[PDB]
């Protein structure tokens, strides 16, 4: 019982782009972008096609980094989130209803107004390792359990 996501971080030698999603699920932290997989599409173009809907920009090649699987207590569905990098992209970045984008500097993500989890595994990211976690939350703020490991093969 898992559903499956994308989440696309756009980092560079020295700054990554984040969103500031405005509305939904995880509204008021900032985060990659991404979303749902569609019938018929494969995981990584579904993840170019997120990227391009929220943050107005074209990718080509997009490198696998990991997969996160996230639990909230009382509810069936696990999220299969498969996360993906590039440093590589097109287009200047678009603030929409939905999404207000912003670079940071590495060492200013901003943690404490990101999901929880991404304390652990985006250090992994920054230093181009590749990583396996799984989260389980209580509502939105509480991680009561995890696993994450780096791995060779996503
Ligand atoms: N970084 C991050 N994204 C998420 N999306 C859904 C649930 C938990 C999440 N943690």
Known sequence: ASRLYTLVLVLQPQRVLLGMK?????AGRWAGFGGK???????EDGARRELQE??????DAL??????????????????????????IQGTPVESDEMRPCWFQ??????????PDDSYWFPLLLQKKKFHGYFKFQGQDT??????????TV
Do not use: A, N
């Open 143 to 152: 991680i009561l359990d995890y696993t994450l490991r780096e791995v060779d």
């Open 54 to 59: 929220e943050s107005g920009l074209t990718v």
């Open 37 to 43: 997989v569609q019938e018929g599409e494969t995981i």
């Open 22 to 26: 405005k509305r939904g699920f995880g």
């Open 106 to 115: 590495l060492d200013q993500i901003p943690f404490k107004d990101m999901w």
């Open 63 to 88: 490198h696998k980094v990991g997969q996160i699987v996230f639990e909230f207590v009382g509810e069936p569905e696990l999220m299969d989130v498969h996360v993906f990098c590039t440093d590589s």
